[PDB]
């Protein structure tokens, strides 16, 4: 009974979106990344480090999503995550190098959305295709079979966090660990040249249940111990 497309969030602020017949629908406006978010990102300066941005409380998310169908979606202007001119990459290239990613991390037996950087990394790059509805483009990328993006430039944007997602305080970077991104799927989405729309980076994260978080936390601990023990 929700609409087919979510209202637009300011870039860097997450929305909860659920699929309608397998398709997630999101929207983006045309305001720049807020200085606040840009500053947390600038603080991230041979292993990846990350700064937690939002905490996830699955039991709180369940109050508005009892069947746990919603994903956490965060979007950024693509220039925020890469300096590559993506429109000029070869037609057959599936990925693009990035300087940072917004993806999930598990620490202290809790899931968070963090910005991570520090080592060479890429994400899939795909083309959004035009549809029969003005301003709505359709994309498909690894882990997200169907996503529509509505380019609603001019509309106001929201920074209000939905129940179950909280703002993490602090800008201190911590090692990213071993399983970062385990619950996320990201891509840089390119729009038709005729549209005039600049590419957008989208990160879609699964809301992990307490059982899933514990499993990942246990995996993180084990991989860390193995790494520790395998040093000279």
Domain-by-domain residue ranges, the chain?
A: 14-207, 208-232
Q: Which two tokens stand for residue 40?
A: 């947390």
Residues linked to residue 126 through DSSP beta bridges, in sequence order: 189
Region for 22 from its dihedrals, namely left if φ exceeds 0, alpha if ψ lies in -120 to 50, beta otherwise: left
Method underlying the structure: X-ray
Burial, 135: exposed, middle or buried (Cβ in 10 Å; 0-12, 13-18, 19+)? middle
Residues linked to residue 88 through DSSP beta bridges, in sequence order: none
Note whether 116 and 176 are within 8 A (CB): yes
Distance CA 180, CA 164 (A): 20
Distance CA 24, CA 45 (A): 34
Residue position matching structure tokens 């703002």? 167
Distance CA 129, CA 136 (A): 9
Q: Which two tokens stand for residue 56?
A: 């996830």
Distance CA 176, CA 38 (A): 19
In 3D space, the residue among 219, 214, 229, 218 whose CA is nearest the CA of residue 58 turns out to be: 214
CA separation, residue 137 to residues 13, 73, 95, 140, 200 (Å): 21, 17, 20, 10, 12
181 Cβ contact partners less than 8 Å away, ≥ 6 residues apart: 101, 103, 104, 116
Note whether 87 and 190 are within 8 A (CB): yes
Backbone angles phi, psi at 79, to 5 degrees: -60, -25
Distance CA 119, CA 98 (A): 10
Note whether 29 and 155 are within 8 A (CB): yes
Q: Are strands 136-141 and 144-151 parallel, antiparallel or unpaired?
A: antiparallel
3-class DSSP state of 218: helix
In 3D space, the residue among 57, 51, 60, 70 whose CA is nearest the CA of residue 12 turns out to be: 51
In 3D space, the residue among 77, 112, 87 whose CA is nearest the CA of residue 182 turns out to be: 112
Indicate the DSSP class of residue 51: E
In 3D space, the residue among 202, 155, 162, 176 whose CA is nearest the CA of residue 106 turns out to be: 176
Residues in the chain: 232
- Distance, CA of 171 to chain centre: 18
3-class DSSP state of 217: helix
In 3D space, the residue among 188, 186, 185 whose CA is nearest the CA of residue 93 turns out to be: 188
Residue position matching structure tokens 């601990």? 221
CA angle 118, 124, 128 (to 5 degrees): 135
Instruction: Report the CATH fold assignment for 208-232.
Output: 1.20.5
């Amino acid at each position: 009974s929700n609409s087919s497309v979510a209202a637009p969030m300011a870039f860097g602020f997450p929305a909860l979106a659920a699929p309608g017949a397998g398709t997630l629908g999101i929207s983006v406006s045309g305001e720049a990344l807020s200085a606040a978010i840009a500053d947390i990102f600038a603080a991230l300066k041979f292993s990846a480090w990350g700064i937690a941005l939002y905490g996830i409380l699955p039991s709180e998310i369940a109050k508005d999503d009892p069947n746990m169908m919603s994903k956490i979606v965060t979007s950024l202007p693509a220039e925020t995550v890469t300096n590559v001119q993506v429109s000029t990459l070869p037609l057959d290239q599936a990925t693009v190098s990035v300087t940072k990613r917004v993806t999930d991390v598990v620490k202290d037996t809790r899931q968070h959305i963090a910005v991570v950087a520090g080592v060479p990394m890429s994400v899939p790059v795909v083309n959004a295709k035009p549809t029969r509805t003005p301003g709505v483009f359709h994309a498909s990328f690894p882990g997200v079979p169907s996503l529509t993006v509505s380019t609603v430039k001019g509309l106001p944007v929201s920074t209000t966090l939905p129940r179950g997602i909280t703002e993490d305080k602090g800008r201190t970077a911590v090692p990213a660990g071993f399983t970062f991104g385990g619950g996320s799927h990201e891509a840089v989405i390119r729009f038709p040249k005729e549209s005039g729309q600049k590419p957008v980076y989208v990160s879609v994260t699964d809301v992990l249940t307490p059982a899933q978080v514990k499993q990942r936390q246990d995996e993180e601990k084990r991989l860390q111990q193995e790494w520790n023990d395998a040093h000279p």
